[PDB]
Amino acid sequence: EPRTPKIQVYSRHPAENGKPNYLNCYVYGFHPPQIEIDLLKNGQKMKTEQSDLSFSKDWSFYLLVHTDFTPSTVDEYSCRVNHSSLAAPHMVKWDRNN
Amino acid sequence: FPQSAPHGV
Amino acid sequence: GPHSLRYFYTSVSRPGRGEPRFLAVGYVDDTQFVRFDSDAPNPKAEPRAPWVEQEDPEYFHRSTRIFKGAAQIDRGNLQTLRGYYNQSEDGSHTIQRMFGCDLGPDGRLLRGYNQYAYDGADYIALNEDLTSWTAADMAAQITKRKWEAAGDAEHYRSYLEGLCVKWLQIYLDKGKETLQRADPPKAHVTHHPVSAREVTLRCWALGFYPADISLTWQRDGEDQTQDMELVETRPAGDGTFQKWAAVGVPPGEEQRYTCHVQHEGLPEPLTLKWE
């Protein structure tokens, strides 16, 4: 029944340790629309903004969750996602090359 | 500019 | 060129947790310009692009009026559908409506849309004749018989051939330096060593609007689509879009590979390589 979300975790611009940037978690292709999406700094929930729920031609939902962040060698960033389609919350690491 | 359906389902 | 006006209605039942919640958003192409949430207190229709903010307050009152209409009609749909499918009052269910119009380059209606899904699946949709419906199954068939009896399509037509095209041209005109000023991608290749055997060459496209783009790799004139890594286009968060396509090539061999970028924002297609 439920469709399982695709997740990318990426910065708005190429990342320079020290330079403020925006951290994005784009989750798409899911159904039903009830979903939990969090950005984590070292596995800790950040203050984020979530976009207005919309869907594509195939009726699957998509959401941009985002925040200001300043990358460092020290800090690990990741996106946590619980949906009905998942056995348990998935966490996707931010890699600056993704 | 939006529109609601005259009738339900 | 070809432009679209689409609304996206989403109503979700919350068994136990009160009445269903209704959400609506309005888009011109890949730019969102309005939203509505039935759960917002004193719930209005809110501008979500700069070029709508310059409309009389009645524009927003009328929309508000219409979304409340849409919210309430759905509250009823949700319960009639439980009936139709003979579902208990226990589980959350979802009704979705996508509708609007497309215009051709000459500014006349090309196509009109009015389609519904139940729990993410095709329920009923207005055919291109703008007169008959395709129902997905036996439940939606009942709706086909009703809406065809009542002659509801005629009212969507009214709106399509009237308001829809009218307000699209209005938005296209009032948002020219966004909606018709097409952003070209700024393209660049990055070099990610994996092993002695392969380097990942990644062709980045950034700052493009609208979202549509072809990102492709060629080794010696020869397309690598079947052999390349390629993320789904993603929002930058500033109204522009991102995409990359990667290929695992033997080191030394980089200059065999040319990345290609097609976007309407480009006067001529970009061919680039590593450096």
Author numbering:
A (entry chain B): 1 to 98
B (entry chain C): 1 to 9
C (entry chain A): 6 to 280
Paper's wording?
The MHC-I molecule plays a crucial role in antiviral immunity by presenting antigenic peptides to activate specific CD8+ T cells to clear virus-infected cells, while its downregulation can activate NK cells and trigger inflammatory responses. Bats possess distinctive characteristic in their MHC-I molecule, with prevalent 3- or 5-amino acid (3AA or 5AA) insertions at the N-terminal end of the peptide binding groove (PBG), which may generate a unique antiviral immune response. To explore the influence of the 5AA insertion on the structure and function of bat MHC-I, we focused on Mylu-B*67:01. Mylu-B*67:01 contains the most common 5AA insertion sequence, MQQPW, and also exhibits the D61/R67 pairing.
